[PDB]
Write an enzyme that holds these catalytic residues in place. Sequence first.
Site, PDB file in Angstrom:
ATOM      1  N   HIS A 294       0.889  -1.199   0.000  1.00  0.00           N
ATOM      2  CA  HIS A 294       0.000   0.000   0.000  1.00  0.00           C
ATOM      3  C   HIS A 294       0.909   1.225   0.000  1.00  0.00           C
ATOM      4  O   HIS A 294       0.412   2.354   0.118  1.00  0.00           O
ATOM      5  CB  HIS A 294      -0.925   0.060   1.219  1.00  0.00           C
ATOM      6  CG  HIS A 294      -2.044  -0.927   1.232  1.00  0.00           C
ATOM      7  ND1 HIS A 294      -3.237  -0.660   1.867  1.00  0.00           N
ATOM      8  CD2 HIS A 294      -2.167  -2.154   0.718  1.00  0.00           C
ATOM      9  CE1 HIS A 294      -4.047  -1.699   1.730  1.00  0.00           C
ATOM     10  NE2 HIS A 294      -3.416  -2.620   1.037  1.00  0.00           N
TER      11      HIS A 294
HETATM   12  C1  LIG Z   1      -0.311   9.794  -9.762  1.00  0.00           C
HETATM   13  C2  LIG Z   1      -0.826   8.485  -9.244  1.00  0.00           C
HETATM   14  C3  LIG Z   1      -1.383   8.682  -7.871  1.00  0.00           C
HETATM   15  C4  LIG Z   1      -1.988   7.468  -7.267  1.00  0.00           C
HETATM   16  C5  LIG Z   1      -2.521   7.696  -5.900  1.00  0.00           C
HETATM   17  C6  LIG Z   1      -3.660   6.784  -5.564  1.00  0.00           C
HETATM   18  C7  LIG Z   1      -3.338   5.299  -5.644  1.00  0.00           C
HETATM   19  C8  LIG Z   1      -4.467   4.402  -5.238  1.00  0.00           C
HETATM   20  C9  LIG Z   1      -4.045   3.102  -4.629  1.00  0.00           C
HETATM   21  C10 LIG Z   1      -4.882   2.214  -4.172  1.00  0.00           C
HETATM   22  C11 LIG Z   1      -4.809   1.431  -2.899  1.00  0.00           C
HETATM   23  C12 LIG Z   1      -3.663   0.516  -2.880  1.00  0.00           C
HETATM   24  C13 LIG Z   1      -4.020  -0.895  -2.444  1.00  0.00           C
HETATM   25  C14 LIG Z   1      -2.929  -1.896  -2.724  1.00  0.00           C
HETATM   26  C15 LIG Z   1      -3.199  -3.290  -2.241  1.00  0.00           C
HETATM   27  C16 LIG Z   1      -2.140  -4.276  -2.677  1.00  0.00           C
HETATM   28  C17 LIG Z   1      -2.384  -5.667  -2.209  1.00  0.00           C
HETATM   29  C18 LIG Z   1      -2.315  -5.878  -0.710  1.00  0.00           C
HETATM   30  O1  LIG Z   1      -3.119  -5.280  -0.009  1.00  0.00           O
HETATM   31  O2  LIG Z   1      -1.475  -6.653  -0.254  1.00  0.00           O
END
Ligand SMILES: CCCCCCCC/C=C/CCCCCCCC(=O)O
Lengths: 359, 359
Positions: A294
């Site tokens: 994350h």
């Molecule tokens: C310019 C790009 C900006 C991005 C910012 C926003 C990104 C959003 C991300 C979403 C949430 C991430 C969740 C990842 C989970 C991975 C798997 C796990 O939980 O193990």
Amino acid sequence: SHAGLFNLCVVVLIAVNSRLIIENLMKYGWLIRTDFWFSSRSLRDWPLFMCCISLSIFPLAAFTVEKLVLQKYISEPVVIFLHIIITMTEVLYPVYVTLRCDSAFLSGVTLMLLTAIVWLKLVSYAHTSYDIRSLASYYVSLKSLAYFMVAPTLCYQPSYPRSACIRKGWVARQFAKLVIFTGFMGFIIEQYINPIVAIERVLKLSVPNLYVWLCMFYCFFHLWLNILAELLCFGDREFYKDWWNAKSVGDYWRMWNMPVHKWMVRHIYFPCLRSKIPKTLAIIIAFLVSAVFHELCIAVPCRLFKLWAFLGIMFQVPLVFITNYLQERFGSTVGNMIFWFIFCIFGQPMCVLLYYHDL
Amino acid sequence: SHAGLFNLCVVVLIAVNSRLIIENLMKYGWLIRTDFWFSSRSLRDWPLFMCCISLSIFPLAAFTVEKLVLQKYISEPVVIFLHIIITMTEVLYPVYVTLRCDSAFLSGVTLMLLTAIVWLKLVSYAHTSYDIRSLASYYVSLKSLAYFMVAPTLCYQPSYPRSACIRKGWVARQFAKLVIFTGFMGFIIEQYINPIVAIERVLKLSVPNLYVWLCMFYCFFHLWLNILAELLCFGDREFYKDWWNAKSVGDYWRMWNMPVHKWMVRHIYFPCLRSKIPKTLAIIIAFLVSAVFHELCIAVPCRLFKLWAFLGIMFQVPLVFITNYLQERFGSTVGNMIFWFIFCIFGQPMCVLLYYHDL
Ligand SMILES: CCCCCCCC/C=C/CCCCCCCC(=O)O
Ligand SMILES: CCCCCCCC/C=C\CCCCCCCC(=O)OCC(COC(=O)CCCCCCC/C=C\CCCCCCCC)OC(=O)CCCCCCC/C=C\CCCCCCCC
Ligand SMILES: CCCCCCCC/C=C\CCCCCCCC(=O)OCC(COC(=O)CCCCCCC/C=C\CCCCCCCC)OC(=O)CCCCCCC/C=C\CCCCCCCC
Ligand SMILES: CCCCCCCC/C=C/CCCCCCCC(=O)O
């Protein structure tokens, strides 16, 4: 039972934003925000696609070592070291590509999300293969591994689930919602989220952001995972329980994602129980293997020198116990209310806004 | 399953209204809006309470005529005329009191709502008694009639339902929510609803109003009816189905109120089916006996010379068929969306705002 509350929220957003939604340059482009908002062909995304295609080699290496274990010369710990270094390189190389190459809102984020999914699947494949081989045809094994990799689950052996039915030919009834729904978020970022283009106001800043998360929860979990399961004819189609009906933050992590919850239960809680390690460290390990996924999603593409999301996810371990005590003292309604307040003020959606304000 | 979405909405309202909710004159009065907002002892509500107590005579007259039918001298149509004129006076006298006496937001409205409930119960008692007597102890009959009148149902013979358990002694866990929840509406009317203290903006005016309705749906149906059922130990505790998951406006009327739906089904649809009257007139009759009770609640206390709610409720009969055709053509999601849009723009909540703007 249905998404009636979500439809109410969408209608409310349309009604309150009547000046811009109804009146817009819709003569040539029906998109709400811009003809090309999230990305465009001008961006040099070809290296990113090339590396995404090249990422499939690590599953091939896992397959070849798993096939090579049958030879008597190769032993167990060498295979374990090979799996460990293959998984480490599989997470390191995309990070190097993203740092050296450019990134965007969706162009750079998708490279990191696929990396985490393949890392979890690669660990899941290796652990399950080790468990199967512990107890005393190339084409079928390769087909099963490919089906596991493409399927919307993080656990090996998805054969036992079976759709046993023909996939819906008229999938456009569902897919056409998604491109519409992603439009609304494109509006919501434009109007509500615009700090710089009494004692505190972060709560006032947290009201729209949590609505972006739930919509982002609706686009991915409800629509895309179901579409992947139906196209691949995968049996189980329950990717999340009623996470909104969570008495505490601890219960939210179990409900919001069933593939990730099952992966954590089978790979981090089950061997810890088998190894006589109490579930007091497993929570830190589970949250450690969630924060790393994350933080790589959000810090790697943009700048990163402060307000790291890893610390934010790691701070949840106090919060789950605190919310458990609070809800156990003050009843389920107070537990749900304080859970929503914590999710608003220090939850996952706030991490995205902390980085948006930084850049 | 639970009210997690409602808790999310409450937390969002608290967060967005952080300047006023957190900062307020809470040193002596913990109420959000005013120490005495909805009503106060200065208002001359004593005649209203006296007439509310005097309203219990019409049930006594229904009881005495129902007991007197056993005499051979009295016949059937004279008893029917007596029931009709007793029901007519029971609705006429409170209207006269409300017109002559003063009214307020809650002081005058509660007189009219009890009148409609007693009228529906009085018709329900008479029809059920006629059905029971058609086929070939004062104390028990009076006790049963009183239990029916106080119980939260519009249908006679509630004996078959039975709680068969001791009522919850710690009812303050529930009741204490209600006085809190009614506080929030007192804030919501103050800030959002304040017109005078491009092409159209009524949709922008409809966004807060529908939130007042759902909260008003939560205060009455979820909390108060359950409290009445538990205190009286009434068996059934399902006063409304999932009305938010309504594919059309027609299905909303069946789900939003189960006592009223059951009364309409047993008294207006069942004899029409027995009388060979198709369900094309019953809908107009059902909505005629609903508009008269959605117009006396709102027009009688305040002024009434235009924008009558009776026409608004009567306009639903086209709308249910139109929404049925629209949802049957465009799927359940489009049906729910157009249902929410109709409920926002021309639904019940808009009738209250039409009268608020008038006064
Ligand atoms: C310019 C790009 C900006 C991005 C910012 C926003 C990104 C959003 C991300 C979403 C949430 C991430 C969740 C990842 C989970 C991975 C798997 C796990 O939980 O193990
Ligand atoms: C080169 C082009 C590839 C491009 C993509 C094509 C996908 C098909 C893929 C792969 C073939 C590659 C072969 C190589 C390895 C194969 C192994 C593999 O990864 O395949 C399986 C995988 C595929 O689906 C995905 O999730 C992949 C990610 C795709 C979506 C990102 C897209 C663009 C950005 C944002 C989208 C906007 C958000 C709305 C969604 C609208 C769009 C959808 O599914 C699962 O099994 C996982 C089981 C589910 C649990 C995983 C943990 C969930 C945790 C967190 C997020 C929580 C918040 C939700 C939203 C998060 C995002 C904000
Ligand atoms: C003198 C003091 C009496 C004062 C009240 C004491 C009640 C106990 C009562 C009676 C003893 C009298 C003996 C004389 C005859 C006895 C026959 C009788 O009426 O008793 C049964 C009845 C009692 O409960 C009530 O509903 C009565 C109304 C009381 C509430 C109004 C109160 C103040 C204003 C607004 C409240 C704010 C709103 C939040 C609620 C928070 C507060 C709750 O219940 C049912 O059986 C009905 C079955 C349910 C279906 C009926 C159709 C539902 C349709 C529509 C409304 C839809 C929108 C909902 C909200 C509507 C309001 C905006
Ligand atoms: C100054 C007071 C202003 C009051 C305006 C708002 C009144 C709110 C009324 C609520 C909805 C009325 C529903 C009545 C249902 C009666 C029973 C039936 O449906 O048959």
